[PDB]
Amino acid sequence: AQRGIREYDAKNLLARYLPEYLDDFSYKGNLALVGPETDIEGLEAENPWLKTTRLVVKPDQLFLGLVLLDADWEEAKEYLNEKMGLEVTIGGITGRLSYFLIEPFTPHKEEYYVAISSDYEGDNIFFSMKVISIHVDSLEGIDALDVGSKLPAELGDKRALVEEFITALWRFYSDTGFAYVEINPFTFSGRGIVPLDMVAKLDDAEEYWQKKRWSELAFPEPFGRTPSKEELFIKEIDSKTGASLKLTILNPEGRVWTMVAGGGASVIYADTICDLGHADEMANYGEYSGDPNTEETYHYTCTILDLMTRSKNPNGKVLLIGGAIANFTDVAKTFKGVVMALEEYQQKLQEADIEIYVRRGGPNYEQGLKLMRDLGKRLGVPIQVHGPETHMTRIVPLALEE
Amino acid sequence: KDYVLFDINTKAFVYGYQTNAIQRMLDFDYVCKRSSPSISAIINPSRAGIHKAFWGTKEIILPMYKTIPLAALAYPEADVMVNFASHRSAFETTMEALKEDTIRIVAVIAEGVPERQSRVMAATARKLDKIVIGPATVGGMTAGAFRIGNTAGTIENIIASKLYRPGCVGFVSKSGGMLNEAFNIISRNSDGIYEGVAIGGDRYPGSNMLDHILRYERNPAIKMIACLGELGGEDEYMIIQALKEKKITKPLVAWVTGTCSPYLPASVQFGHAGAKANTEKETAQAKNDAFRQAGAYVPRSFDDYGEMVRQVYDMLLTRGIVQKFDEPEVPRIPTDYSKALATGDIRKPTTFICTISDDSGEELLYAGKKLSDVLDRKMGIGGVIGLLWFKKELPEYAAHFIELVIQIVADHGPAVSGAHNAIVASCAGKDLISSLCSGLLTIGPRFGGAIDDAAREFKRAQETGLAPEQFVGEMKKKGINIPGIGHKIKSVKNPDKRVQLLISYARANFPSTELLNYALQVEELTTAKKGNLILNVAGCIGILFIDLMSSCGAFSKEEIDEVVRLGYLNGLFALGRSIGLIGHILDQKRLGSRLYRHPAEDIAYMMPSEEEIQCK
Amino acid sequence: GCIGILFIDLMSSCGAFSKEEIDEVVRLGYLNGLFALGRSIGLIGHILDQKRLGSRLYRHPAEDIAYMMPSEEEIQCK
Amino acid sequence: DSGEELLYAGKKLSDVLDRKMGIGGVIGLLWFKKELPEYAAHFIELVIQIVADHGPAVSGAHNAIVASCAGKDLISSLCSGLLTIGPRFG
Amino acid sequence: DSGEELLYAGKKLSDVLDRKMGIGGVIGLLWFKKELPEYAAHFIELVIQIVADHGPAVSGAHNAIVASCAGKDLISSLCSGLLTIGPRFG
Amino acid sequence: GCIGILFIDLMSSCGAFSKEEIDEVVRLGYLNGLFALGRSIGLIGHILDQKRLGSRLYRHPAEDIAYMMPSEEEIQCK
């Protein structure tokens, strides 16, 4: 998945690794990130340049009237002491401001734009001072191209400096596992190059090959949402296996919970719930696949059950254990983990008026459905069990209408 | 034909030791009536060798090679590689296979492969006119001809979905699990799939859906195209553009999942790596609308996908475009024993019984008692022997008598038969186990192993009412030595303090020593004749053990008779004396001892004459 | 692995062995003797258990063996 | 064994027993030629109890059971099973 | 051994005997899975005769004699001596 | 040494073994089996000879063993 990173992290990566491709190390790594529990005096002792330079302070929560330009360290502290924890609505989402980037103010005239994104044939570099697109083939690389043939309109004295900068930026993009990079805008500091704003996405699948370059960074949560201990626990299980275990909480107070097998089928179950008008009651989006073991499915089921039994809802709650007919995921071993968790949550399941609906096919499915049927006869909660004879998503209207 | 991916003559390598996937492929080949398996060799980077698997009910051998070039050189007819390498090695192994002139198709199963690596694999495949299915896919299959690894699951599912014979539908999806669900949907609403492929859910696949859709358009056997896409990326726009440019003339059923997305937050990343609509164009709504406008048969929701398939198939059937065919005979395959056993269908008797220990549960049991409770109760080595040999939790003094015996017989110098043989084997450079067994194999009637017979013979004499003098007299008349009597170095002049130590313990702790008292009377008579005819350590152990069993209350008369008859007590000497044997072996290794050869001057060589060997 | 590793820690820390003595113990192979000695208790127990059970002679079942003879061609050359 | 009393690494058997050195203490003398600290002799005894048996299915127990089923005496059956102790088992 | 007639590397015991392959030819089949040339089967038989015995003093013969003097049965005594066969002897 | 070396020459020159087959025979250790098999004839003969002779139990003579016990000081420390 393509994951966005803070302007602080992207500029720090550019400051650290771009001077290896470009011989113009004019851009220093003068950056300061301010979080909620950040001791101002510690960051002041870490960055002496703060007190002796003109500053820029802006929120770094993946985003206007919020950028503070050309200020003193005292004036920067005023912006920080006022805007921290401020409730703001951006894109319809209401969240508090918690992360801010402090960097030196570069007095500029020129404002040039550069962006690198990828297509099925290679990478595309976009440049503007209306916008030129330069395609870099996957097998040939940048060396095969004369980047020089760019905008003649105003470039001349610095046409070679931009040619060199965007060639180095592609190498940085290609070797550091980026999925997207945008410097809108960039400027000149004499004969050097300075980035003013930076938006970046890393391909999180590159992690194994980027242990040294990504050492100083972590992926932030999108604006508005707060980190979830349950979501990070599922991500932890997912990282130690070739199998897939994914969980995203949409609404903690939602009536409809899902534990669907597969990326494809889980989306279809969400489509059906939304098509019946129950998008608001959809408590989560999740999936498990790639033949996870009994212990892994047990911990996954335990987490969904825990989150589902925290609040008591008047019309009860529904648990949809669905999926397609599997190709290799063992239904007996996975459902053994599901049954073990349901057995543990027996008292909490009855007290929350939870109804379980199951539809599954695949290796040893008859044995797995037998476990669920035997469980429903002793647990004390309604467990409707279906196999490949029932249409995949038929348990959705059966639970939300019937 | 360029449009054919796999046929009934397709030969493949399976990269990675995936025994279940290997069996699934062979089972499909068998039910499809193939003459030979679809797998030429297995590529196992850890080991070269052989792999045994089934061909119906018959076992066959598949060769296993360490590398892709070695396997390709051995089986040049194999043009497909089913790659089960992890996401850490999927790129280099696929690229190595693509560089082989004889490999044309590579299916990449791994999830978590970088987008850049997939871009390079896709471009390498297109440049060399090869095909990459994946990453992050089960694969696909040509009905009745070939299956990629685990594609279409169990043979039961293959039979229920009629995948052993081709239909008229050319199918392609992103999702692996949905490809199997679709095989079921299509089989129930048409004559089934001819071929089905899952390209994976990554946003930069090795092959796009259109690559496969264009092959279906050229294939005359396919009269209907069906596809299931999803939100994120612009793959489906290649199909819509081909549909608009009249490149796809066959009727196409299409559905794009992800209609839920606008109802949920924009930040939600779905299961597949590429399932995230970055732009409006990437949404399921924009894709399904553009599909409708391009002339495709688009259902109202996923629920009516099979109904749209049924409508398009029925249309072809009435118009004569597709012809009704007779259903071929339903294939059969034996069920795996493990499945029949798990479902309770069958029962199989055990050959052995074990009553002394159980290692099959959560905790090791010694005669039913958890090892934890044995240790918490400080039963000791004597208590462990009570459980494992006698199946009793013995009184403490009985467990301590067993431990006392082990210490007393641990060693009796290097000169005895067992220690001597173990030393000779150790001097010959033998390992500890061989040297130990060389010495233990001397334990028998003259050395060490007299304990069982001493217990047997003294118990019989005392029980049948024989006076000690009558027992001594009877054994002499039969020409049988009294077991437990006599010694090579110990005698009246050189008393055996080990015997004294065992006797003092029994007098202080056993409720009765009647057999010992009888044995000591026999000893007075034997030593009166010859001083070396003492009650030896083996006789002392056997006799005292009978008194221990008789008086401790833990054994019935029958249990004692069984112990005597079966021969338990020589085990005590073997166990105890193993301590000294191992010590002697180690002593010779520390000393750097040389090979021993018995001196010639200690052997009288007395060959028979020529006359003696010629007749009697 | 647990016994071997812990025995090295025992010898290293009990004060009764010099570095040379520990090296000699490791090089010569003492520690497998502990398993031979200990496991002899259970081996003798299993032997006696079969004698008490009156067990019959065992012959491995044919159905658990794949007999795969070489061809006449294979035994005639290489 | 050649004198008036059996010696284990120079120590009289009587003194070994009077001092309650135990089976672990006897192994300390005979294998290591040391009078070990008590906790070291008890660790040897703990190991013996812990590895005494691990069911009938392991190589050594299995071979000893097959020899016992073939009517073999205890010593032959024991050695049949001990001879499986090597790099993979034990 | 599972059919109508015992096979040694696929060859019927009857054909092994009718062809007079001998003990060397049986070892060629059972150890090497080859029907060896006659002089190769005769070299195996020559080796067996040449190493049959080298007196009572060698390690293996000495240990087998000690076990036999201790009243042991033939099989136990034989294995006692065979277990000395290693890097220095044999 | 003579048997091992000559067997390599036999395998190399008889035409029945490929270079790989010879390498496998050498690596796995077949040839010590020949000595075990052959010498079993003489071992069984020596066992039977002692039974015919009515031989008594052997105990190695004490005069052929140097008993050298460690001191009390040696067993107390290193």
Ligand SMILES: CC(C)(COP(=O)(O)OP(=O)(O)OC[C@H]1O[C@@H](n2cnc3c(N)ncnc32)[C@H](O)[C@@H]1OP(=O)(O)O)[C@@H](O)C(=O)NCCC(=O)NCCSC(=O)C[C@@](O)(CC(=O)O)C(=O)O
């Ligand atoms: C011990 C020995 C083989 C000695 O044999 P020898 O070869 O010296 O004597 P033989 O040639 O048989 O005869 C001499 C003359 O005395 C007569 N005579 C001998 N034994 C007689 C007897 N039992 N009953 C009546 N009469 C007897 C015989 O009839 C003849 O008299 P005569 O006919 O008038 O000419 C022999 O006694 C014997 O088989 N005993 C029974 C087996 C037995 O209990 N074994 C256990 C010994 S404890 C042990 O193994 C552990 C050990 O302590 C060993 C160690 O340290 O050595 C350790 O911890 O390692």
Ligand SMILES: [Mg+2]
């Ligand atoms: Mg999946």
